[PDB]
Amino acid sequence: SERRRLYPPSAEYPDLRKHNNCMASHLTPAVYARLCDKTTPTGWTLDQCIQTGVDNPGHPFIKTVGMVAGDEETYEVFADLFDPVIQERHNGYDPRTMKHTTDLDASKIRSGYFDERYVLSSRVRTGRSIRGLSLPPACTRAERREVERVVVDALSGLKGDLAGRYYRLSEMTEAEQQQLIDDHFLFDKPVSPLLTAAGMARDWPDARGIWHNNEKSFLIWVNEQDHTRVISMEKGGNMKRVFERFCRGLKEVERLIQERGWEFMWNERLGYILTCPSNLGTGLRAGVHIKLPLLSKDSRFPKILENLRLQKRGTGGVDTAATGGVFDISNLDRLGKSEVELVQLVIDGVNYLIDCERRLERGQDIRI
Amino acid sequence: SERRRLYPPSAEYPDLRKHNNCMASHLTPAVYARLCDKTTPTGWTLDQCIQTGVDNPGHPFIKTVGMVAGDEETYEVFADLFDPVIQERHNGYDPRTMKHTTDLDASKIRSGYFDERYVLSSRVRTGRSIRGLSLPPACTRAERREVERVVVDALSGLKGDLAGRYYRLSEMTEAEQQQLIDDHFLFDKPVSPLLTAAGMARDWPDARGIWHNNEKSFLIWVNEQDHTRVISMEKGGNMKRVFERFCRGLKEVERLIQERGWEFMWNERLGYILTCPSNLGTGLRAGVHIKLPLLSKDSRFPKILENLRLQKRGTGGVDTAATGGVFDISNLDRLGKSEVELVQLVIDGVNYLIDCERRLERGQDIRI
Amino acid sequence: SERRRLYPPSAEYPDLRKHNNCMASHLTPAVYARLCDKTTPTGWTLDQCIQTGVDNPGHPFIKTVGMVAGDEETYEVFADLFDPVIQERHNGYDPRTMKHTTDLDASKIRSGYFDERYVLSSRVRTGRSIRGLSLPPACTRAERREVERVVVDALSGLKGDLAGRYYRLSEMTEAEQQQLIDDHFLFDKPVSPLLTAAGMARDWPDARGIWHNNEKSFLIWVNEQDHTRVISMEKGGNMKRVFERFCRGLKEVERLIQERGWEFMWNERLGYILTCPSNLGTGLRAGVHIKLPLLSKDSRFPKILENLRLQKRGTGGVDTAATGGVFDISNLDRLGKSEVELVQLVIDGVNYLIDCERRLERGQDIRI
Amino acid sequence: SERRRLYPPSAEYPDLRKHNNCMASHLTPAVYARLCDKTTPTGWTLDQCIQTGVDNPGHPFIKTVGMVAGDEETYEVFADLFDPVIQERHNGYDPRTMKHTTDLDASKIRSGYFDERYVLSSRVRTGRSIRGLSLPPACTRAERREVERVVVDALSGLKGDLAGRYYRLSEMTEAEQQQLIDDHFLFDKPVSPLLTAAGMARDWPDARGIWHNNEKSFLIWVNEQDHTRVISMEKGGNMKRVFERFCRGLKEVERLIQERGWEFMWNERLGYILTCPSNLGTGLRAGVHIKLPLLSKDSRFPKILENLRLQKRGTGGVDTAATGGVFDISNLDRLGKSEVELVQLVIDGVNYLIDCERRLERGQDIRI
Amino acid sequence: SERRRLYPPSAEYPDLRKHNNCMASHLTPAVYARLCDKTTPTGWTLDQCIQTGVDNPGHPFIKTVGMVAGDEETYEVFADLFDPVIQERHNGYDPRTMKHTTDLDASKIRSGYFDERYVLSSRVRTGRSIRGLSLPPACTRAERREVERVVVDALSGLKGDLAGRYYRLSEMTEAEQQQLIDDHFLFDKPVSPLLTAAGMARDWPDARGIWHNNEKSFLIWVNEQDHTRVISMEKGGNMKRVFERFCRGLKEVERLIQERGWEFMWNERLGYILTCPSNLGTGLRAGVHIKLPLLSKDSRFPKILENLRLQKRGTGGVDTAATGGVFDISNLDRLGKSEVELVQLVIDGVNYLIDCERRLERGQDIRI
Ligand SMILES: Nc1ncnc2c1ncn2[C@@H]1O[C@H](COP(=O)(O)OP(=O)(O)O)[C@@H](O)[C@H]1O
Ligand SMILES: Nc1ncnc2c1ncn2[C@@H]1O[C@H](COP(=O)(O)OP(=O)(O)O)[C@@H](O)[C@H]1O
Ligand SMILES: Nc1ncnc2c1ncn2[C@@H]1O[C@H](COP(=O)(O)OP(=O)(O)O)[C@@H](O)[C@H]1O
Ligand SMILES: Nc1ncnc2c1ncn2[C@@H]1O[C@H](COP(=O)(O)OP(=O)(O)O)[C@@H](O)[C@H]1O
Ligand SMILES: Nc1ncnc2c1ncn2[C@@H]1O[C@H](COP(=O)(O)OP(=O)(O)O)[C@@H](O)[C@H]1O
């Protein structure tokens, strides 16, 4: 009957009195009550958006957004809660007013070569979603298989240096997968509670895979945390070559994908849409590992790092710590700046860090 | 259940990598995704609109639109795809901004007499659709029979020189139909793939017919490719008389049709609505055949023809080629210009063509 | 408004006064009125079922059903019209009461070797539809591509003698396709009016292909007239080996298809569901070509052939005639009998025909 | 099914080629097609509005509107057709633009006494509808009974000179009803085709009645052609007393009706809503009979009458003619002018008419 | 539009080619296709039912069902898949035909005392669900809080020896929770993949708690894996006292719950409804730990255990192994047998096990 009463929204309000994530900070009873009825056309709802944040109050060793998007419409349907979170996460970028600009030019990134005694590794990463298909948090098996087929068919057209092969996770022996993971190429099974709570580990390892070139300098993860994750890696400090290869490969992949009538998720307000609001905009993360004996001498590291808008993850894996200090240092903000700008910022920050080692003298300049 | 997922629009996107029609040129994944859910009140959909273009990439010896309209609402519902196609097809006429004006006056078409040694035939054609009834691509049997009844009842009222008789295709012996076709009067069965793919050959020959006057100088095809096709023909170069008869007969037919409460499809933005976007506006085609020994001497013909906005089809039938060169030359653009203007343009172009007989001198002037 | 009146069903009733197909014979105003509102869950309707029959009254040189099915549900939704047609087409088999049994055993088909001087070719064909996907008359582009992907992935698992390769029609040069067609391997473009009117030529050649083994003795047409057409052919009279290979290959293909969670359309009442009601049940056609000088001496062929329940097509296919008499003789009925029974019947009929070479004496026995 | 086609609106368009009513004049195929889907909340439709006009092309001896309203919403829902009709019927009043003002003051109508030798009868009539109840063309039995109950209960409260009694038509002997009709008090059974075609004779004589005061100078017809018709009569030429009594009685009746929570249909754009668009606005008709020997001498009567905006009906009954000339002369326009203005206009026109007795002189002044 | 096509069910079919759980064994494409549209009134669907089984193919050291129920209606809506699974899991009990009988009598369980040198612990467990509230896999925050409130209010009425207190998990320090877990009283956080994949760890630790008596011999877990889990423990081999206390406490709890108008989920076909089909029927598990030096001598243990219908989990925790062999031995089947019968079976099995200590002789009797 229509006379039956629903549970009032405040009855469903999560208990976030001990949470320490941006979703908990920016969620209020008014917002929850306002948004608890809405839903994206594919059925995504607010509770599904904030489940990962609700279940995970902590997760060292970095601050977490606590939200995910089930599809493109989410960021528009639940903008009343995503917008403040995005603004806080990206040092003040305002999606409501500002616009995002993307440029991928390896010409305007001159220099960008690091000392081989302090870097010994350079990687550039980005993510891409296929329009019309639900994101990993909400995708069904059919949608995941469709994403895999589209990506594999597109990548089959890559020729020349970028030519490579696709390896299905379900067809790889555990030893091979472990060897690939230990080499920083493949992705590990999603056991971290943040991924599991978001629902981005359903049906594992179905429809997940890795497409890599023969030199393994150009890789593409299929269906791990986004529809596609494009990676360009090199064991050294030559960020210039890595970024040039990344740019050309990404352009070719986009062209091949569009050839078949598929287009990436994108809007000028937010840039490239991805699951985690922390990856919006360019979704780009350019970083380098650090030599063990050197940066270990730092004492006021976090202040300097927040000074330069850089983030320091441990060795391979965000969930891992740093032992025998070798830190993966990358840019912190991915929205509001162009890819070239982000790479230049990373290069400048790393040059500062290696210059700030000061193994002969003492003194931290910070230099806000 | 509502949790089941539909095929993403890009999955249905046609493969037009080898097509050479305006629909293929102006169709993009964004447009297809935007329009793949809409539908006219009678159920016409985008796929039905573009089926003929998808199936037919070629079709010599002229460029083809590759689209058809199922009803009046189509041009409004799918305007996002029809408008660029119409603009390209009609040398820049912009339906969004401009307006179309129609005038049928035989007084302001002074002159217009061709040399009898180079024309020997003059025809004028137009199309008309009855409002409220689906177009041939989408019409059911009941709608087709209704169109036939309305047209026949209206035409029964014609008196005087225009007085004529209606002949039902289903009641005509094959020999009589073949004789009429060979005389350029009747229409042949629609075997060309463009007509069949559009669905404009369903239930043949049911409800199709030809109404012609005793002299056979005035004819009306019922349910061939439009609801009505009004034709005025004469074996000679006297375009003036042909056009005068065409104008008066068309006015009388329109009056008789409106007498019973039926009105033609029409809107000032597009003019007279017809199935093929190439026939919008006036839908008028005025043309003449050409004497065999004469125009055969031409070498740079296509450049001159595109110069004058004229189209050259072979002998009887667009699908046929030209042998022993005798070309059917007509106007190319039917929207944005009035009927009088189009006829005057055809007369000027034909006078230019005959003036360039070059049986005693050489040189092509083009004269853009 | 709800006060508006629909066209009465009799207004839409087709004009079949001159038709000569089973649909025209068994269609009555009462049946049409009863069924003109129903529709299968995918939207198939009666008019779409009978369009091919309505448009085509003739089509030599064989009697035609005049109907097609858009999906599995059709045969159940429109049973009131399909059942009499099926019963008449399959010499009295009653789908309402009887049941169909299928057995594919090459052991119980002993003998089956024809004289090499009168056969010189032996082929066995069947069709199969993937459950859950619309049939070629109604399938959209996405469904056709899904069928192609499922079939190709399944067939990739065939090993040993059956090992083969898939060739996409869109990627084959016209010369190669013509050579394959002339060799009786590949299928030609569907230009015959029966196929076009049924809508089984939309989006050609998208998603159509041929998968064949290295010896080309085992072929599979993908998306030509059914979802799959499995063919086993040999240039000779050894029907035994051909049928054995056909049986084992079909079993392997079915196993591979089921491995991935796809099941063939099938119900014990009708057997294997296919587009044309003439292919229901087993859908099997076993046949042989005939030597030119020999059977040409016959005069009362049609009576004998109808006596033996055999069909006589042209050497080039159903749509071609027989010149320099070389007739493709096959079984006529495919529903109500098992595959082994049909093959044995074909063998017995061919042995009877060759026994009646009438080179020594004369006289036709008929032998009903 | 949704694929079935409705009859196109032009198929339902009435055949008005021989009609002579305002509805026929102002009805066009475009208007009919536009309005043939709409309907008032109570279910009234355009065909029901125009049925009376369609069935009746003639009806001497006056020009007829040819339309009726089923409820209050009609004039708003079908304004596209009622507005031109109202404008033509009320000599230019434009309901879209201008507003209507009502005043009932017997003080500002000084004079207004006619010669007893040329009038011998004075009547004033008006109509009123109860809001929330369907009009007589569309009212069901329950609604008609509700109207009767509301009106009778209200009128029971009248006191003093206006005190009277209610007589139910179903409880009155035929002789009494005939006597009342012959005295110009009661209304006759609705046998005229205009009333019957409009559906305003259904369930006769159920729920119809007459409430009159003891002197029979104040009367109220219940459910004859409107919900209420208030009438004030006097056998003489004293229009002043008749009109003041009419005003006070109408005010008292309105007060009593509003006492119980019922309000009259009214909007400033149109005034008081009634069934026939010819009665909109005030709905007031003030008139007088004429002595037999006197006005019979007129020859150019119609021109003069149209000059003064007066209408001449025969003796008792609009449907009746004038024998032994005694004409009922009243105002022609009821909308756009106030009641006092209309009464003054009638008085001036009657004074003009009697002044033109022409028993001793000659001249048709007309005096536009 | 309604012309868009859904993904065929076989496209969503899980890839279970390597799974080893009952759901994978008893899931077929036909069943999946049949059930993929249905849904319980609260929105539970088949994919949600089988997600835990799909994600987890293994999970030593016991065979897993691989399914869960979202609410009471699930077992009825998806019976076509639950029934075979239940039958296989409960050694042939047929829910379709048979009925379940429950009796909780401590009188008819005479004896039941184990040797203190081989048991040193005795526990009895059961589960209960509140009717009208979604099960832990599907319950929202409001429903979980409602379950907690109902259970706590009911348990507040327990008096006498059963008198106890409720401890909210969110209000207990980590040290206290760890101490309780190490003592085998409290439940640990659900980190095992089977619980997480089923969605039974959402919003942890909100609304989860433990209500225990002062002696801690009677405990009730609130919202861990069922709505309520009632447990009775004793550090010894006196199963008689444990079971009688369990019976009386359960009866009192049920009475108190029903006092407020709440009733347990129950139907005679299945008994007491719970999330995991392995806990249906009584949901009872009676077990004992085993002394370290003793049962370690066994070699053919699994055959004997399957002989006696007993299951051997490791030490505290099903997910944990057995080191220094001390096995938790309990009954294996909970549906089709009464609680008294199950406890007697457990007692007989444990007596057999201890009798087969073989510390003096050798030989395994099995004794099927
Ligand atoms: N600079 C680098 N050099 C080598 N490997 C890297 C680098 N940065 C990241 N990786 C590899 O990427 C994998 C996942 O790292 P993660 O923190 O998830 O980066 P992302 O943000 O791109 O997911 C790790 O296994 C790690 O080895
Ligand atoms: N100038 C002409 N003289 C004689 N016949 C003509 C002429 N133009 C067209 N026709 C006749 O019209 C028929 C169809 O021509 P088509 O190219 O379809 O013209 P339309 O554009 O009006 O369809 C042909 O059979 C042809 O004989
Ligand atoms: N027994 C046979 N031997 C050789 N070729 C054959 C045989 N049967 C069919 N074909 C070839 O297959 C092609 C299509 O045959 P068709 O008449 O469509 O058979 P079906 O009815 O099974 O489709 C033709 O080109 C024909 O040459
Ligand atoms: N001036 C008048 N004097 C007497 N009776 C009248 C007068 N005007 C109208 N009536 C009476 O009203 C009755 C109906 O007349 P009708 O033309 O319908 O007027 P209305 O416009 O009020 O309907 C007739 O029977 C007639 O006798
Ligand atoms: N016989 C027993 N004696 C002592 N503790 C037990 C016994 N059985 C179970 N437990 C305790 O119950 C907790 C959970 O046990 P579990 O294996 O989940 O039982 P269930 O299969 O009923 O969930 C463990 O921490 C364990 O210490």
Ligand SMILES: CN(CC(=O)O)C(=N)N
């Ligand atoms: C660890 N996280 C959370 C974040 O991005 O803040 C991922 N989105 N992977």
Ligand SMILES: CN(CC(=O)O)C(=N)N
């Ligand atoms: C041949 N065509 C295509 C076109 O007009 O371009 C017809 N519409 N008939």
Ligand SMILES: CN(CC(=O)O)C(=N)N
């Ligand atoms: C030629 N036909 C018609 C028939 O089978 O009768 C095909 N279905 N191919």
Ligand SMILES: CN(CC(=O)O)C(=N)N
């Ligand atoms: C006679 N008529 C028609 C009209 O008013 O024009 C009535 N409405 N009574």
Ligand SMILES: CN(CC(=O)O)C(=N)N
């Ligand atoms: C470990 N399991 C699976 C099972 O019961 O089989 C739980 N339901 N807890």
Ligand SMILES: [Mg+2]
């Ligand atoms: Mg990462």
Ligand SMILES: [Mg+2]
């Ligand atoms: Mg043409």
Ligand SMILES: [Mg+2]
């Ligand atoms: Mg064939």
Ligand SMILES: [Mg+2]
């Ligand atoms: Mg009247």
Ligand SMILES: [Mg+2]
């Ligand atoms: Mg447990």
